[PDB]
From a paper:
O. alaskensis employs a tripartite ATP-independent periplasmic (TRAP) transporter (OaIsePQM) to import isethionate, which relies on the substrate-binding protein (OaIseP) to scavenge isethionate and deliver it to the membrane transporter component (OaIseQM) for import into the cell. Like the ATP-binding cassette importers, TRAP transporters utilise a high-affinity substrate-binding protein (P-subunit) that binds the organic acid and delivers it to the membrane-spanning transporter subunits (Q and M) for uptake. The structure of TRAP substrate-binding proteins comprises two globular lobe-like domains connected by a variable hinge region, which is formed by two β-strands and a unique extended α-helix. Substrates bind within the cleft between the two domains, which close around the bound substrate via a hinge-bending conformational change often described as a ‘Venus flytrap’ mechanism.
To define the molecular details of substrate-binding, we determined the isethionate-bound structure of OaIseP. OaIseP purified in 5 mM isethionate produced crystals that diffracted to 1.25 Å. The asymmetric unit for isethionate-bound OaIseP contained two monomers that are bridged by water molecules, where domains I and II of each monomer interact with domains II and I of the opposing monomer. Isethionate is bound in the cleft between domain I and domain II, with a closer examination of the isethionate-binding site revealing several key contacts made by OaIseP. The sulfonate moiety of isethionate forms salt bridges with Arg156 and Arg177, as well as forming hydrogen bonds with Ser95, Asn98, Tyr153, and Asn217. At the opposing end of isethionate, hydrogen bonds are formed with Asn77 and His244 via the terminal hydroxyl group. Aligning the open ligand-free and closed isethionate-bound structures gives an r.m.s.d. of 2.7 Å over all 308 pairs of α-carbons. The conformational change primarily involves bending of the hinge region within the spanning α-helix and nearby β-strands that connect the two domains.
Residue numbers in the entry: 29 to 336
The structure:
Amino acid sequence: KRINIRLAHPMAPGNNVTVGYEKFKELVAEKSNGRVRIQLFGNCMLGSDRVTMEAAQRGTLEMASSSSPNMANFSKQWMVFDLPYITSPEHQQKLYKAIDDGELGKKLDEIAASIGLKPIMYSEYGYRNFVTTKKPIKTADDLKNLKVRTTDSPIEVAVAAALGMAPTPISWGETYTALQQGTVDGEGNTFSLLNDAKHTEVLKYAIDSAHNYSMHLLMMNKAYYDSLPANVQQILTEAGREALTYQRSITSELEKKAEDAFIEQGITVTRLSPEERAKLVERTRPVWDKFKDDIPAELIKLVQETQQ
């Protein structure tokens, strides 16, 4: 027959994650000669991360993508990637290698299996930077007192509290309204998502904190995956791998465009000195011990090994 597979996600038009899933869609169609069709429900068409991944887990959707921080709703183990400053941009290829070809990726795959999901793409999303609507922020101490939107990650909540901020978990689709209404003073995200989602209209200041690393985890309902013929299973996984290579390749080009757009629209972007970054690293480091019982030590070590 034909097979139609629905894929929902929260990310904005033109965003690195979004474009990756457009490439996935194209590759699935090519490899199947049109027999398998991915229907894309991006940009919170069917809701934000949690609600659509819950639908994928239940089987009311075939596929969904959630940011890794929002995946904490489904397993605590994903929080390894939220630990503040567990990774930094300088080591990204070695992180990719461990996920793609190594033991780390196998462990992630097992986490997904344990919650009824088949991973198809570990999409790059990027490093979050703190941004504000009104308050000048240039240093760690300037973050104090800010009311800040978070994802659902317990670690993001704890990071904010350790920085002296007041964390406020808001779904992605509702975050712009909260900023516009003054419910929150700021947020932390990639400059690209912020620009693509047109948060840049309400923002005034940014710092290159890189205080959270996120992926966008594209998951298929495991029962649905296991129901498919083997040739279609292989199409999906091969398309995922090829789409991931493509999506990583365009990510930093798009990030550069967004940083330029921030500039153009008058947002002040402060580059932290080594000293000021080290303060942030240490101020957030106590969060790690608060989650030692929820994140396997072996998994922390596999991630840290990528940064050596």
